[PDB]
Amino acid sequence: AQQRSERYVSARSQHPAWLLLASRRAPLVLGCLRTLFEEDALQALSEMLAAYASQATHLQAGRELREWIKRRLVVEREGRIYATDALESAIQFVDSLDSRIMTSTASRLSVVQREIENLETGLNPSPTGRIASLRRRIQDLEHELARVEAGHVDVLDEAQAIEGMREVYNLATSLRADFRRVEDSWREADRALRHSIISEHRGEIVDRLLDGQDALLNTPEGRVFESFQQQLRQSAELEVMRERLRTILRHPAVPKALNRPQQRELRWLALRLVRESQAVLQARARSERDVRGFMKTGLAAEHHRVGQLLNDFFNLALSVDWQRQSERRKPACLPPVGVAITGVPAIER
């Protein structure tokens, strides 16, 4: 019980999402960032911060943007800004305060029961139990078919139909939750690999890594994403799912269950899923290519020794008197590099 409070305090101090939520300008920052991912970031942030004085804009806009970049809420790669998982967690929390779909329903209970049955029968190696389960399910389906042949077709009521539609939307919309998480997982592996290469720099490690064709940057989330995207490619079931969704969306009870944006999201589910899954493998390939290029450049030892020398110089610099203009202007010991020759004074000759 005591450790929970310490964990909460640590999360409050460190985690980017809670810091963003507790920030002074949280609502406008959240709105602007969410609009963006749907210089230019700095310009739009300044524009939004302009007509919200209430409660020198361009200076504080840049200061806050660099503060969030430091906190790793957003990431800067070369000259571009990319979103992380903390931003999406904050957005999900904020925009769920208005409308949240209930999960204490009968449909969710039936789904849970069927899923538990499926898992339990899938973990069983004995063949006799499998045969018994198959026979029981076949008999139940045959009984239902016999009942239906007598003219007892069952149709969900309006309330049950609305409940089912909302539950299906809630389950289907959760497949995009962890797309940024995989990329965040790969970036830290990249950083750790580069740090290990620099601190080691031994050329044998670099040569061995370059020689092998086995891919680097392996993480637990990457394997889960690979397993997901492999099954995503089996179009023989994606087509059936899309057709069933199209059939479902043409029902009288749809307007009372979902509004326009939700209907749009359910309408283009498969296309958007495939399109967004294809945009993560490219990021992984780019990361691996950049790592291999950095390794092939071969300037790690220079970085290490220049860092050591800079640390020595900075340690020494604390023992001099910077308050005297005489010492601040004393000539140092550094050679001329990139000498630009004096213009010949012929001028007009």
Partner: protein, 509 residues
């Protein structure tokens, strides 16, 4: 006008006094004269028991049992009355012992604050004698101007709210009520005016947190050492897949040397080679990132919420001391120590070797945060500062160590005349006047103070200063200075001791 002044003190079986006793106070001045050890300090201890949480006497049990003159079931009560133009307030206490179990947790106490004229000491005693505790807490439902508290904390909070004073006025009044000798100016100002707000407690917590962080650092180092040993086995397996079995066995032996239980029972067989590899993967993808993340989080939190805030707190305390000194200097202007002259206080920061070392270490800590070493340099820089704090806190009875964690010792005070006894008395009186006055006002609501002690001219200015600041005084003297008090004080309280009993007689000159 609008200032309460003390009028009387009543005792009942308190210390060496047996039964009921009463002492009067004059509106101008009063001297508590009597032979040494006859009970002069007992009266003031009884008065100060009602005003501060921890008086500097040796405890309530000794006074209750008359350390023994009273054993077993017993009752003791004390009271004090303050009056003004058309108003009266009374502060009292009743403490009793049920039996012979003389212990700290067996003494039952109640504190009383009253305004109605029907609440007297004898009424409280009668109610206790008739109903014990319930009859004492019952009078709140049968009257209006009575407030009982079975708690000194709430009682003192209410008392400090009644007279619109700060949280340290009564502590200062108690400190200057038994001071023996007027010492040097720095010693007086550093011991009898400023409050003790040293930061020796936070240093221990910071040191404990750092010692906790060292364990996480050690775990991270162990994990890195294990991974560095395990990698050559992975290299050797690739070499073998391309004799070399001896080198592979040697590498597996080296890997097993550094293991701590993961590779518990394995061998140098080629069948066990995959197992080693799996362990390496678990090191690379799961354990090391988690340990590094936890280490970085703990390092940042300890470096920011730990040692950084302590020094800022100390600097803020020094700034508050300087501001209060400026306010005291402003207060002291409205008086003439000499014709057309007044005193002024100046504060100058001192320097010490420990302070210079601490500041240099702090600069190193600030400079080490810009290195990208995965926190190694930052940890090394923080370690030296924590070590300095530990060394300072270990020996808390030295000038160097107290110069670090005690704000009052980071300054030196001087007095300007823009005589030691007169200057000390003026500073003490100005501090008392500043403490006992509501903000934005110059008239105290609590007026009575107690003093201990010099020719006639020496004491002739103290009385003038007290009258100028608007304070009523009660002096304590032995039977030695009964010549000048006759000219200033206009009443006297005499304590006669006969055996193990004392009696008080109040008379005018």
């Amino acid at each position: 006008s609008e200032t309460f002044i003390l009028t009387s003190i009543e005792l009942y079986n308190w210390g060496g006094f047996q039964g009921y006793h009463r002492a009067e106070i004059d509106p101008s001045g009063t001297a508590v004269i009597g032979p040494t050890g006859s009970g002069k300090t007992t009266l003031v201890d009884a008065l100060m028991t009602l005003l501060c949480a921890n008086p500097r006497y040796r405890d309530l049990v000794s006074y209750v049992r008359g350390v023994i003159a009273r054993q077993g079931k017993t009752v003791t009560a004390i009271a004090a009355t303050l009056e003004r133009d058309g108003a009266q307030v009374r502060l009292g206490a009743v403490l009793w012992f049920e039996g012979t179990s003389s212990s700290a947790s067996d003494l039952k106490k109640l504190w009383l604050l009253s305004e109605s004229p029907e609440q007297t000491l004898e009424h409280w005693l009668s109610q206790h004698h008739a109903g014990g505790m319930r009859a004492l807490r019952q009078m709140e439902k049968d009257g209006m101007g009575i407030w009982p508290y079975p708690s000194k904390k709430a009682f003192l909070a209410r008392l400090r709210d009644y007279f619109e004073v700060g949280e340290n006025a009564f502590t200062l009044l108690n400190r200057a009520a038994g001071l023996k000798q007027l010492n040097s100016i720095d010693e007086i100002f550093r011991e009898l005016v400023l409050d003790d707000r040293s930061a020796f407690e936070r240093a221990a917590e910071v040191a404990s947190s750092f010692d906790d962080l060292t364990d996480i650092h050690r775990e991270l180092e162990t994990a890195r050492k294990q991974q560095r040993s395990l990698q050559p086995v992975a290299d050797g397996w690739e070499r073998y897949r391309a004799d070399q079995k001896t080198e592979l066995a040697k590498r597996m032996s080296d890997a097993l040397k550094a293991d701590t239980g993961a590779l518990a029972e394995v061998g140098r067989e080629l069948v066990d080679v995959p197992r080693y590899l799996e362990r390496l993967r678990v090191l690379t993808e799961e354990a090391l990132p988690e340990k590094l993340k936890r280490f970085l989080e703990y390092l940042n939190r300890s470096s920011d919420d730990g040692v950084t805030q302590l020094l800022s707190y100390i600097d803020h305390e020094v700034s508050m001391i300087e501001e209060r000194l400026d306010d005291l200097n402003s207060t002291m202007q409205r008086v003439d120590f000499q014709p057309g002259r007044y005193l002024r206080l100046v504060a100058k920061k001192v320097i010490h070797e420990s302070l210079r070392t601490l500041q240099h270490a702090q600069r190193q800590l600030n400079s080490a945060r810009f290195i990208d070493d995965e926190g190694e340099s930052h940890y090394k820089a923080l370690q030296a500062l924590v070590g300095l704090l530990k060394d300072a806190c270990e020996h808390s009875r030295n000038q160097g160590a107290k110069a670090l964690l005690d704000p009052r010792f980071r300054l030196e005070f001087a007095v300007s005349v823009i005589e030691k006894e007169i200057i000390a008395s003026y500073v003490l009186t100005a501090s008392l006047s500043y403490a006992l006055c509501p903000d934005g006002s110059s008239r105290p609501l609590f007026g009575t103070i107690v003093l201990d002690q010099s020719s006639h001219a020496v004491a002739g200015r103290i009385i003038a200063a007290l009258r100028e600041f608007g304070l009523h005084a009660v002096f304590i003297t032995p039977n030695k200075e009964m010549r000048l008090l006759r000219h200033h004080t206009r009443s006297a309280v005499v304590v006669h001791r006969r055996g193990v009993e004392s009696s008080l007689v109040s008379l005018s000159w």
